[PDB]
């Protein structure tokens, strides 16, 4: 599965 | 090594023509297994190649849940790095993020990746340590100061370590017969004249996998590294790749000169020559 | 910066008169990702044209195929059109059976 999301 | 797994994600803004796009796109290697686009009319991750179907609903929901969230993410990215820049929001704008793991021959874990890019210029990569950043300039560390706070790197460095390994050596099992099998490249030289006293030699290698190619050519066995002109590396539509290296040569001296082709799905590397 | 897109048009397998095949029209090295692709039989837009899911390389710069199934004839003339922000006027490019 995809990475966990983040904000930049 | 022998095999990697990677995600490529774009995500665009364009002022005056609605919200941010964001495109994932998963690889194994040089095959493409998943997809995403917020564009699309019921967006939701779709497959790519024939061994990710037999996924569970699981693992699609999740997918989803995952991709649909990075588009409401980066649409905020885009806002936060238009700000760090003072930029005006009328231009548009880029963020891509690229991330995945690289196995070797014996199926362990060579080194993790996560890089991130502005308009196509460097702006945040995960060190080869696994813990530590490296920004590309004072609006980089912004980011990296939040990275940090969320502990970020802790994260990523367990799921490149995990996750990503796993699920890499699951779809290398689930798709061998294709993902593990190297087809060598069919190969010939071709000639053209250029004048009365020069032709071209054009040495092609047609339906390969994977993309990894060497073609060469030399000269009394020099290697004509400056006089080559070779061309990108191009999918044929049917999983393979294509690739040509030409080079000029005095008319009557083509016997001098001899391409050299190296891939992995040879039993040994090639040699040849013009055949009249 | 801006970088403008490298183009390739070819067919997927050797082309045989009058046997059935895929022109293939490919863009690469280019930057930002908007891009626009049509495959042009005699100098007119072909339709049912597809194409790959976006993707980049190491550089970040974009890649994609635009493809469509195909006949070649020793008569008909086929081409790539490709239109970009980098591009003043779109760029044709014709297809040469050995290239």
């Known amino acids: 599965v995809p990475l966990r999301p983040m904000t930049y | ?276 | 910066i801006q970088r403008t897109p490298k183009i390739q048009v070819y067919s997927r397998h050797p082309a045989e008169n009058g046997k059935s095949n895929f022109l293939n029209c490919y863009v690469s090295g280019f930057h930002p990702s908007d891009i626009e692709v049509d495959l042009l039989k005699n100098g007119e837009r072909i339709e049912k044209v597809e194409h790959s899911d976006l993707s980049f390389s190491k550089d970040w710069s974009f890649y994609l195929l635009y493809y469509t199934e195909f006949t070649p004839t020793e008569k008909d003339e086929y081409a790539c059109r490709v239109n970009h922000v980098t591009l003043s006027q779109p760029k044709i490019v014709k297809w040469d059976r050995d290239m």
């Open chain 2, 1 to 276: 090594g022998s095999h990697s797994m990677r995600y490529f994600y774009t995500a665009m803004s364009r002022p005056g023509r609605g919200e941010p796009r964001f495109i994932a796109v998963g690889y194994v290697d040089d095959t493409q297994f998943v997809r995403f686009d917020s564009d699309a009319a019921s967006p939701r991750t779709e497959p790519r190649p024939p061994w990710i179907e037999q996924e569970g609903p699981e693992y699609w929901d999740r997918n989803t849940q995952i991709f649909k969230t990075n588009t409401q993410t980066y649409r905020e990215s885009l806002r936060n790095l238009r700000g760090y820049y003072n930029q005006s929001e009328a231009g548009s704008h880029i963020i891509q993020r690229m991330y995945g793991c690289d196995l070797g021959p014996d199926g362990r874990l060579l080194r993790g990746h996560d890089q991130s890019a502005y308009d196509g210029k460097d702006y945040i990569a995960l060190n080869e340590d696994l813990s530590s950043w490296t920004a590309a300039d004072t609006a980089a560390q912004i980011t990296q100061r939040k990275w940090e706070a969320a502990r970020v790197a802790e994260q990523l460095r367990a799921y490149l370590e995990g996750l990503c390994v796993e699920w890499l050596r699951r779809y290398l099992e689930n798709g061998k017969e294709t993902l593990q099998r190297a087809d060598p490249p069919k190969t010939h030289v071709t000639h053209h004249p250029v004048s009365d006293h020069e032709a071209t030699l054009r040495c092609w290698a047609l339906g390969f996998y994977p993309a990894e190619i060497t073609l060469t050519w030399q000269r009394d066995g020099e290697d004509q590294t400056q006089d080559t002109e070779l061309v990108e590396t191009r999918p044929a539509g049917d999983r393979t790749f294509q690739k040509w290296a030409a080079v000029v040569v005095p008319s009557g001296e083509e016997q001098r000169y001899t391409c050299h082709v190296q891939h992995e799905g040879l039993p040994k590397p090639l040699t040849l020559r013009w055949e009249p």
